[PDB]
């Protein structure tokens, strides 16, 4: 079923969708800090592998708002609740790795 | 003749019940949950017209928090008061409340802290939008009730959310979406499937199959008459346990909408006033 | 030197004293440890704090003890905790600042300093239970333990009340602080005047939850004759909800006592103050978790007070005793005569099985459910007595003194708070250890419907009432029964002669049947045993002369429990099968058993 | 002492299912099948509070179709000697 490959490219596009959903997943949840798992799950429920993957890619694009701190007891998420999601919107737009990766 | 109710929707996130905090009070919120124990709709005041005959009555306002009393101030006049009452049933704003005590979603439950239900009152046309024993999403309107107060969320937007563009399943699935497309490519596995159901059991296969299929479809819908029932009821008779279904059923514990009703002595609390019986297994086996 | 008026706590001077310590620690603890990492922890940990920016330093207590300075600081802390911790937090922020300044630009930039960091000291003192405590210590750090009984939902607390005026309106709002809210009569904007109603918007006020946890404390070390006290602690803040019910937790907090108004109408207060725990540190710490385990987590409490190592040797020694399998069964019931195989099967019930989670699920635990019947006055009671005595978590109950509900979920009105409160019935409690069931044959048909769920599930699902849940209760079952006979009488179907559902019957792991052949020739002996004591009237030499352990047993049981995980390998397999084959030649469960 | 007019004829005939708040408080004609229909009890509706601590009688109130709520604060107090309705002196209805 080449329907599969269709789904593959489609998801490749849904990266951006995820940015937009995560961005503002924070914002329509007037918190901007959080339990990474939680929102990960809500946005997940919108559409886990894909989910965590997005968690990663966003971290990479925006290693400013986001920090991941492994502590004894585990890796704690760090999230800058004051980061600017518009700038972050355009930045997410431009750096998909410029969609070159 | 002026009554307006405004309902936002399409909020970006979803909050867990336990996730609730006192910081979020008085701001709208997002919660989905399992409905329990609905209550009959009862009229409200919104604004009530109550005042004394001295000198003028049925000033229209408040009783806002459940009190329900009373006329607050500038009584009577000129009997200025205090006094009390008098309420015009001629003039006030009824509403609603059906209220409901909803439970947190089952799957979520962190071990072992166990579920905690909360109550929410259905005001406005969102009333009755609810169904008991149902996963449903709501807009927070959260706030509080005295008790000393106890927070109780409220609901503007009642969504029963919780098929398909099988794509949008794939799109939804997307990450594996690569992986098991192979499975679609793959074959025989009707065996391997069959070769997977109740690993517990030696043989017992015709069953293992049967369960599998039972999980499968067969379509609602005629419109002549009966929407053709897709569902299939399976009976398995046997010499007693040692696996009875003492095995098979328990195994079948692993599944969606999955209702393991131990014994038939309940007595039909199943369908009590959730079909413990049934409405919970809707699109699932009890 | 300033002071605090009664605290004798010099304002500052401990800020230096601390500052020195905080800055400079390394491990002086290893000295107490006798030693046998080099660098000081506090700075490093603190830096981690700054980076992560989590505030909430839970300290140690005692690192101070033993270090000079701060030795006294240990004392004053235990004594006058609140003020102390305040000073502590202050010094802490100041120190964070002085640190950033070293780093020049730090974390973009100065906001973070304004944020609040707080001490959550733990490990403080060896506190004796609760019931022990005197009014002498109303406010002190105190250590506690044991499973979590029940927990109230969050209860809002306005530090800050919220008020508005009829005029103009102005929205001004008063902070509670002291536990009364004194509202202004009139008025803000207008002001005026005017004796204009100042409205209190309850939706607009602040809320703290500081949650409420019913605590069932186990200090162990039970002086007797006391029965476990239950506790309730107010937590506060981030601590709230961090605890699942039933957790076995170490937490420390401030002893607290409050009067409560009796009339609920009149201003009267009850004198006779009511004590609660303030709940400082638990063992957010929740977020920290095994970051706590860093610094190695106190050498695992120095083995958690394992046996006199010598005693352990005694254990491993007695293990060699070949008779041990028997000797134990003897030691089991000193008072009871003969009927050994009983004492044995029980002994196994003490050693029962091993828990298996599979990948998930699995979870056959070790559970074994023994039933026993026979002619009455068998002492059949006495045993249940003994076990119950031994069993830490066990509970002894009578048929018909019972119904399917009292075993679970009373969900009674708390009525202390005038609240409804979920009360674990008998069974949920009994999770762990064993259950002692009188008059099983006589239980209400409603009752024991419970059982099949338990026995099979080994857990319990209550969908009832406000909360629907499946709670796990894993416990052993010991049931007593009287044949209708009450002598079951010869022949008959015994299976009949026992009454009960042949299925529910079949459920019981160990089916013990007691009977009397009138060994003449027994009664004599039994009568000798019995007839003894007699002498001595003051209890002495029950079974003498015979070899038995006493408490060594308890420990041994404990250890074996803790440390053993048997695995049958292949060997059993064959014969094992052939057995159950001969049996059905009966049920699978028989095998499982 | 009194005569009540039944008038006659007002279509309309708002059906059953079709009614709105706009329909409320205004005269409406309708028809339909008699389902379970109440027994009769005399009207004259009044509710009142004998309390507990604050002695009595808190006087008659008229409530409500149908609330009977909430009777917040009266008579000393208002609590904790709080209110209990009495069989004596509470007007009833049955009607239809």
Show the 3-state SS of chain D.
Answer: CCCCCCCCCCCCCCCCCCCCHHHCCCCCCCCCCCCCCCCCCCCCCCEECCCCCCCCCCCEECCCCCCCCCCCCCCCCCCCCCCCCCCCCCCCCCCC
Backbone angles phi, psi at C387, to 5 degrees: -55, -55
B69: nearest CB among D21, D22, D72? D72
Answer whether A18 touches B (CB < 8 Å): no
Distances (CA, A) of C242 to B112, C3, C245, C289, C304: 12, 37, 10, 11, 25
Characterize B240-250 residue by residue with b for buried, 16 or more Cβ atoms within 10 angstroms of its Cβ, and e for exposed.
ebbbeebbbbb
Structure tokens at B94: 């009824």
Structure method:
cryo-EM
Structure tokens at D37: 């229909």
Other Cβ atoms closer than 10 A to C511: 18
Answer whether D26 touches B (CB < 8 Å): no
N- to C-terminal Cα separation, chain C: 74
Backbone angles phi, psi at D60, to 5 degrees: -75, 140
Return the axis-axis angle of helices C14-23 and C71-79, rounded to nearest 10°: 120
H helices of chain B, where? 166-173, 181-185, 190-194, 205-215, 248-252
Q: What is the dihedral of CA C139, C144, C149, C153, to 10 degrees?
A: 50
Tokens 């005694």 belong to residue: C314
CA atoms within 13 A on the CB side of C323: 9
CA distance linking residue A86 with residue B7, whole number of Å: 26
N- to C-terminal Cα separation, chain D: 21
Biggest CA pair distance of chain A:
46
The DSSP H or E segment spanning C460 is: strand C459-462
CATH superfamily for domain B14-42+96-162: Nucleic acid-binding proteins (2.40.50.140)
Answer whether A7 touches B (CB < 8 Å): yes
Beta bridge partners, C477, equal C369, C435
The total number of residues shown for chain B amounts to: 286
Distances (CA, A) of C296 to B109, C19, C31, C61, C285: 31, 24, 16, 15, 16
CA distance linking residue B111 with residue C247, whole number of Å: 10
From the centroid of its chain, how far is CA C33?
A: 28
Residue C69 and residue C203 in one domain = no
Characterize C18-37 residue by residue with b for buried, 16 or more Cβ atoms within 10 angstroms of its Cβ, and e for exposed.
bbebbeebebbbeeeeeeee
Tokens 């026995």 belong to residue: C455
CB B79 within 8 A of CB B54: yes
Residue C228 and residue C241 in one domain = yes
CA distance linking residue C390 with residue C347, whole number of Å: 12
Give the sign of the dihedral formed by CA C323, CA C324, CA C326, CA C330: positive
DSSP C95-142: HHHHHHHHTSS-SSSSHHHHS---B---S------STT--TT-SS-EE
CA-derived radius of gyration, chain C: 31
| Three-state SS letters, B43-69 | CCCCCEEECCCCCCCCCECCCCCCCCC
CA distance linking residue C96 with residue B203, whole number of Å: 68
**DSSP designation for A31:** T
Verify cis geometry, omega within 30 degrees of 0, for the bond prior to C168.
Answer: yes
From the centroid of its chain, how far is CA C576?
A: 39
Burial class (CB in 10 A: 0-12, 13-18, 19+), B97: buried
Residue C142 and residue C264 in one domain = yes
Verify cis geometry, omega within 30 degrees of 0, for the bond prior to C486.
Answer: yes
C partners (3+ CB pairs within 8 A) are A, B, D
Structure tokens at C334: 């000193």
Return the axis-axis angle of helices C309-320 and C324-332, rounded to nearest 10°: 110
SS3 C74: helix
SS3 A82: coil
CA distance linking residue A11 with residue A19, whole number of Å: 12
Residue C120 and residue C136 in one domain = no
DSSP A35-77: -HHHHHHHHHHH--HHHHHHHHHHHHH-TTTEEEEEETTEEEE
Characterize C59-79 residue by residue with b for buried, 16 or more Cβ atoms within 10 angstroms of its Cβ, and e for exposed.
bbbbbbbebeebeebbebbbb
A52 CB contacts (<8 Å, ≥6 apart)?
A: A40
C442 CB contacts (<8 Å, ≥6 apart)?
A: C399, C400
Biggest CA pair distance of chain D:
56
CB B209 within 8 A of CB B197: yes
CB B138 within 8 A of CB B32: yes
CB C73 within 8 A of CB C14: yes
Tokens 């936002």 belong to residue: B8
C519 CB contacts (<8 Å, ≥6 apart)?
A: none
CB C475 within 8 A of CB C426: no
Mutate to test the interface with B, among C206, C463, C472 (most CBs of B within 10 A): C463
B239 annotated as ligand-binding: yes
C121 annotated as ligand-binding: no
CA distance linking residue A98 with residue C155, whole number of Å: 50
CA atoms within 13 A on the CB side of D10: 9
SS3 B246: coil
CA angle D82, D88, D94 (to 5 degrees): 110
C264/D77 CB distance under 8 A: no
Other Cβ atoms closer than 10 A to C178: 7
Answer whether C292 touches A (CB < 8 Å): yes
CA distance linking residue C81 with residue C464, whole number of Å: 44
C108 annotated as ligand-binding: no
CA angle C462, C464, C468 (to 5 degrees): 60
* Chains D, A in contact, 3 or more Cβ pairs below 8 Å: no
What are the percentages of helix, strand and coil residues in chain B, rounded to 5?
15, 15, 70
CB B35 within 8 A of CB B100: yes
Answer whether C267 touches D (CB < 8 Å): no
Determine how β-strand C434-437 pairs with β-strand C476-481.
parallel
CB C83 within 8 A of CB C91: no
CA distance linking residue C80 with residue C9, whole number of Å: 8
CB C425 within 8 A of CB C330: no
CA distance linking residue B64 with residue B48, whole number of Å: 9
Distances (CA, A) of C108 to A84, C53, C56: 15, 12, 21
CA distance linking residue C120 with residue B257, whole number of Å: 44
Distances (CA, A) of C383 to C77, C468, C477, C515, C561: 50, 37, 13, 16, 22
Mutate to test the interface with A, among C289, C293, C296, C297 (most CBs of A within 10 A): C289
Residue C55 and residue C77 in one domain = yes
Which of B247, B272, B248, B277 minimizes the C-alpha distance to B261?
Answer: B277
The DSSP H or E segment spanning C510 is: strand C510-514
Answer whether A81 touches B (CB < 8 Å): no
CB C437 within 8 A of CB C479: yes
Residue C137 and residue C107 in one domain = no
The total number of residues shown for chain C amounts to: 593
N- to C-terminal Cα separation, chain A: 26
SS3 C323: coil
C7 CB contacts (<8 Å, ≥6 apart)?
A: C76, C79, C80, C83, C84
| Three-state SS letters, B152-206 | CCEECCEECCCCCCHHHHHHHHCCHHHCCHHHHHCCCCHHHHHCCCCCCCCCCHH
Which of B234, B235, B14, B278 minimizes the C-alpha distance to B132?
Answer: B278
**Resolution to 1 decimal place, in Å:** 7.1
Other Cβ atoms closer than 10 A to B82: 11
Beta strands in B77-155 (DSSP E): 87-92, 98-103, 117-122, 135-139, 144-146, 149-151, 154-155
Burial class (CB in 10 A: 0-12, 13-18, 19+), C409: buried
Distances (CA, A) of C537 to A38, A48, C385, C528, C540: 69, 73, 21, 15, 8
Structure tokens at C391: 């069993």
Structure tokens at C426: 């008998």
A19 to chain B, closest Cα gap in Å = 12
Q: Which residues in chain A are immediately followed by a break of C to N over 2.5 Å?
A: 47
Give the sign of the dihedral formed by CA C281, CA C283, CA C288, CA C294: positive
CB C225 within 8 A of CB C110: no
B262 CB contacts (<8 Å, ≥6 apart)?
A: C452, C453, C456, C457, C461
C381 annotated as ligand-binding: yes
CA atoms within 13 A on the CB side of D45: 11
CA distance linking residue A72 with residue C126, whole number of Å: 26
Q: Which domain holds residue C219?
A: 127-283
CA distance linking residue C267 with residue C261, whole number of Å: 7
């Amino acid at each position: 079923s080449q329907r599969q490959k269709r789904y593959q490219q489609f998801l490749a596009m849904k990266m951006t969708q995820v940015f937009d959903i995560l961005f503002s997943l924070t914002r329509g949840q007037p918190y901007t800090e959080t339990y990474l798992s939680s929102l990960i799950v809500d946005s997940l429920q919108d559409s886990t592998k894909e989910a965590s993957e997005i968690l990663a890619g966003l971290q990479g694009i925006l290693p400013m708002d986001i920090s991941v701190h492994q502590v004894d007891g585990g890796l704690k998420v760090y999230r800058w609740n004051s980061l600017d999601k518009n700038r972050f919107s355009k930045l997410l737009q431009i750096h998909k790795s410029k969609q070159q990766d | 003749e002026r009554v307006f109710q405004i309902s936002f929707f399409n909020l970006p996130t979803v909050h867990r019940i336990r996730d609730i905090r006192s910081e979020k009070i008085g701001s709208l919120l997002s919660i989905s949950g399992t409905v329990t124990r609905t209550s009959e709709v009862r009229p409200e005041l919104y604004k009530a017209s109550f005042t004394c005959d001295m000198c003028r009555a049925i000033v229209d306002n408040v009783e806002q928090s459940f009190k329900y009393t009373e006329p607050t101030f500038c009584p009577n006049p000129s009997c200025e008061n205090r006094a009390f009452w008098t309420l015009n049933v001629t003039r006030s704003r009824f509403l609603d409340w059906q209220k409901v005590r909803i439970q947190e979603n089952a799957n979520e439950i962190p071990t072992g802290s166990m579920p905690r239900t909360l109550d929410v009152i259905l005001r406005g046309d969102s009333v009755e939008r609810a169904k008991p024993g149902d996963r449903c999403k709501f807009t927070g309107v959260e706030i509080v009730v005295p008790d000393t107060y106890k927070i109780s969320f409220l609901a503007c937007h009642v969504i029963s959310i919780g098929r398909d563009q099988e794509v949008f399943l794939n799109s939804l699935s997307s990450d594996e979406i690569n992986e098991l497309k192979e499975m679609v490519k793959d074959e025989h596995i009707y065996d391997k499937l069959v070769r997977s159901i109740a690993p517990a059991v030696f043989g017992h296969e015709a069953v293992k199959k049967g369960i599998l299929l039972q999980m499968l479809g067969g379509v609602h819908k005629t419109v002549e008459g009966i929407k053709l029932r897709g569902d299939i009821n399976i009976c398995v008779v046997g010499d007693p346990s040692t696996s009875k279904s003492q095995f098979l059923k328990y195994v079948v514990g692993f599944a969606p909408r999955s209702v393991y009703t131990s014994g038939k002595a309940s007595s039909a609390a199943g369908l009590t006033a959730e079909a413990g019986a049934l409405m919970l297994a809707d699109n699932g086996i009890c | 030197l300033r002071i605090i008026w009664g605290t004798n706590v010099s304002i500052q001077e401990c800020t230096t004293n601390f500052r020195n310590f905080l800055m400079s620690f390394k491990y002086k603890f290893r000295k107490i440890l006798d030693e046998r990492d080099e660098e000081l922890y506090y700075i490093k940990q603190l830096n981690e704090m700054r980076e992560l920016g989590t505030s909430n330093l839970n300290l140690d207590a005692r690192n101070l003890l033993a270090y000079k300075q701060t030795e006294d600081l240990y004392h004053q802390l235990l004594n006058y905790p609140q003020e102390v911790i305040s000073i502590m937090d202050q010094t802490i922020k100041d120190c964070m600042v002085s640190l950033i300044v070293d780093n020049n630009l730090d974390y973009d930039l100065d906001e973070i300093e304004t944020k609040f960091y707080k001490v959550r000291p733990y490990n403080v003192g060896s506190c004796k239970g609760m019931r022990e405590l005197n009014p002498n210590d109303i406010d002190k750090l105190i250590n506690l333990k044991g499973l979590v009984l029940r927990s109230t939902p969050v209860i809002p607390d306005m530090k800050v009340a919220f008020f508005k005026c009829n005029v103009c309106d102005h929205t001004m709002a008063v902070e509670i602080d002291r536990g009364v809210i004194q509202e202004p009569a009139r008025c803000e904007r207008i002001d005026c005047n005017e004796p204009n109603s100042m409205s209190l918007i309850h939706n607009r006020c602040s809320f703290a939850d500081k949650q409420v946890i019913k605590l069932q404390e186990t200090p162990d070390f039970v002086p007797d004759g006391q029965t476990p006290h239950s506790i309730s602690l107010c937590v506060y803040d981030e601590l709230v909800d961090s605890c699942r019910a039933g957790d076995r937790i170490e937490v420390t907090g401030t002893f607290r006592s409050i009067p409560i108004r009796a009339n609920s109408r009149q201003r009267v207060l009850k004198s006779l103050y009511k004590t609660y725990v303030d709940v400082v540190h638990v063992k957010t710490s929740t977020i920290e978790q095994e970051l706590m385990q860093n610094k190695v987590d106190h050498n695992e409490v120095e083995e958690v007070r394992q046996i006199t190592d010598q005693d352990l040797a005694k254990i491993r020694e007695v293990a060699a005793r070949e008779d041990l399998y028997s000797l134990l069964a003897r030691s089991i019931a000193p008072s009871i005569y003969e009927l050994e195989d009983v004492k044995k099967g029980i002994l196994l019930q003490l050693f029962g099985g091993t828990n298996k989670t599979f990948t998930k699920g699995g979870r056959y635990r070790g559970d074994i459910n023994i039933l026993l019947c026979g002619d009455p006055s068998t002492s059949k009671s006495q045993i249940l007595q003994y076990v119950h005595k031994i069993t830490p978590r066990g509970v002894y109950t009578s048929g018909k003194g019972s119904s399917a509900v009292g075993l679970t979920a009373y969900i009674t009105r708390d009525v202390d708070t005038k609240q409804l409160v979920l009360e674990s019935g008998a069974l949920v409690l009994s999770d762990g250890g064993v259950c002692c069931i009188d008059e099983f044959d006589k239980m209400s048909d409603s009752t024991r419907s419970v059982l099949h769920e338990v026995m099979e599930q080994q857990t319990i699902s209550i969908a009832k009432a406000g909360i629907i849940t499946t709670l796990n209760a894993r416990s052993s079952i010991l049931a007593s029964a009287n044949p209708i006979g009450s002598r079951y009488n010869p022949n008959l179907p015994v299976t009949e002669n026992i009454d009960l559902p042949p299925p529910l019957l079949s459920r019981f792991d160990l089916v013990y049947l007691v009977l009397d052949k009138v060994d003449e020739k027994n009664d004599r002996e039994l009568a000798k045993h019995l007839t003894n004591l007699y002498l001595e009237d003051k209890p002495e030499h029950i079974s003498q002369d015979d070899v038995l352990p006493v408490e060594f047993l308890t420990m041994y049981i404990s250890y074996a429990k803790e440390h053993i995980h048997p695995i049958i390998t292949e060997a059993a397999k064959t014969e094992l099968v052939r057995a159950y084959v001969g049996m059905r030649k009966a049920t699978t469960r028989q095998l499982e058993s | 002492s009194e005569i009540h007019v039944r008038i006659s004829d007002f279509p309309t005939i708002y059906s059953l299912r079709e009614l709105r708040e706009s329909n409320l408080s205004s005269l409406v004609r309708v028809t339909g099948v008699v389902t379970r229909r109440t027994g009769v009890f005399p009207q004259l509706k009044y509710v009142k509070f004998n309390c507990l601590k604050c002695g009595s009688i808190l006087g008659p109130f008229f409530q409500d179709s149908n609330e009977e709520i909430r009777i917040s604060f009266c008579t000393n107090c208002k609590s904790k000697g709080p209110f209990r309705v009495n069989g004596e002196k509470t007007v009833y209805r049955n009607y239809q």
